[PDB]
Ligand binder design. Structure first.
Ligand SMILES: [Mg+2]
Length: 430
DNA sequence: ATTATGACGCT
DNA sequence: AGCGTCATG
């Protein structure tokens, strides 16, 4: 009762740039704007692999991880932009730089955690307190929430999308208690006002549109973000959780989309996240371990404690290339040439990182895949990264991997390599 | 031949 | 340290 925590102490948002690489290309090339468009890596094999898809193209069934030739079967007018190639490989610098533009804007409003190139969590708790003090008990107008959906509303006693959105928002705001500065629902609503302002600033200052979720923790904010895309935001209140979870497949919750989620489904014989409430914490820990069991117990009630980490920069800087099928590397000269290409891109990115961010990486991770290995990485080995020099880095990587060549001939490499990966890690301030 | 990343957990 | 999982609706 009065002692049961409800996990309503924070306001957290998740901001996701809509089809981010597509938007970067559409800003650069106006002919791609408001068209079915996708971004592809490479071209020779089946037209290249699609990695980002505009919402107009998604309407035709185009998706990521589809070959461009196949996408063109679904969408003959699909427009394509290709990722830049440098040193024989895809080079994502344009998108990393555009991501920095967006993250720097977001950081003006609140502390952000860079979850990925196109996604950031935002801790809004303090900003909401400040805005509530500035809002001396003044109600929140629907005009301050022009792109906000309130999940679960309208309910109870028009046939157009925007009309439905406004009906739900009106029900929410009429129900609000704008007098109580500690009301979690009011706090979320102010959070949504701030996120509208942040999203407007991003669009004005970059041209990029985003969707967002606002809730009391990261998992619910992420789930909320997915409910209304593109270019919209969704508020998931604590009270909305029972209904929302009652038909929510377990795999939709962040971290449960893989083997653990499949095991929850199979072991417990359930389908939906709300069904988890019927198990005790000890029962869940007995199946899924102490940590996962406690997390599931709280998360199915809408409660999660994982903090928004104050981290706007990536923790690693990596360069990776697959060599699939016939392109696998089979000679020593070939392996060394590609290690050098990767290391030259890595050196360029590291030197820029050091100038921009006042830090230096101290560990080099080298990973390879060998032909016929079911795992993504056949081997990972670390060595010291003491100098930002591509030739030294590629020589050191060759040194750490050279004992995997089972070929008795040092000129040949066997079995051929299907992946090379260099990653700089363990940054220290400088 | 579902890339090229990048997060975090386990032991 | 090296390996595995999860994510990119
Ligand atoms: Mg996105």
């Amino acid at each position: 009762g009065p002692h049961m925590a409800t996990g309503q102490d924070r306001v957290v948002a998740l901001v996701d740039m809509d089809c981010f690489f597509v938007q970067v290309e559409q800003r650069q090339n106006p002919h791609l704007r408001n068209k079915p468009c996708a971004v592809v890596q490479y071209k020779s094999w089946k037209g290249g692999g699609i990695i980002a898809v505009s919402y107009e193209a998604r309407a035709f069934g185009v998706t990521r991880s589809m070959w461009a030739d196949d996408a063109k079967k679904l969408c003959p007018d699909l427009l394509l932009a290709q990722v830049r190639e440098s040193r024989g490989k895809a080079n994502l610098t344009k998108y990393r730089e555009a991501s920095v533009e967006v993250m720097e804007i977001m950081s003006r409003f609140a502390v952000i955690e860079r979850a990925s190139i196109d996604e950031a969590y935002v801790d809004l708790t303090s900003a909401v307190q400040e805005r509530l003090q500035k809002l001396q008990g003044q109600p929140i107008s629907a005009d301050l929430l022009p792109s906000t959906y309130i999940e679960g509303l309208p309910q109870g006693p028009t046939v157009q999308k925007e009309g439905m959105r406004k009906q739900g928002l009106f029900q929410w705001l009429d129900s609000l208690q704008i007098d109580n500065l500690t009301s979690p629902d009011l706090q979320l609503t102010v959070g949504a006002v701030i996120v509208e302002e942040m999203r407007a600033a991003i669009e004005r200052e970059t041209g990029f549109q985003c969707s967002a979720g606002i809730s009391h923790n990261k998992v619910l904010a992420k789930l909320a973000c997915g409910l209304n895309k593109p270019n919209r935001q969704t508020l998931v209140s604590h009270g909305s959780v029972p209904q929302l979870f009652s038909q929510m497949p377990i795999r939709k919750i962040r971290s449960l989309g893989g083997k653990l989620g499949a095991s929850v489904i199979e072991i417990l014989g359930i389908e939906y996240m709300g069904e988890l409430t019927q198990f005790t914490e000890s029962q869940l820990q007995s199946h899924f371990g102490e940590k996962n069991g406690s997390w599931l117990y709280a998360m199915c009630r809408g409660i999660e404690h994982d903090p928004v980490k104050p981290r706007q920069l990536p923790k690693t800087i990596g360069c990776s290339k697959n060599f699939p099928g016939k392109t696998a590397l089979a000679t020593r000269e070939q392996v060394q040439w590609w290690l050098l290409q990767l290391a030259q891109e890595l050196e360029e990115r590291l030197t820029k990182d050091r100038n921009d961010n006042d830090r230096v990486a101290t560990q080099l991770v080298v990973s390879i895949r060998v032909q016929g290995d079911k795992r993504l990485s056949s081997l990972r080995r670390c060595c010291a990264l003491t100098r930002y020099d591509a030739h030294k880095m590629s020589h050191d990587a060759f040194t750490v991997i050279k004992n995997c060549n089972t070929s008795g001939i040092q000129t040949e490499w066997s079995p051929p390599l299907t992946m090379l990966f260099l990653c700089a890690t363990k940054f220290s301030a400088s």
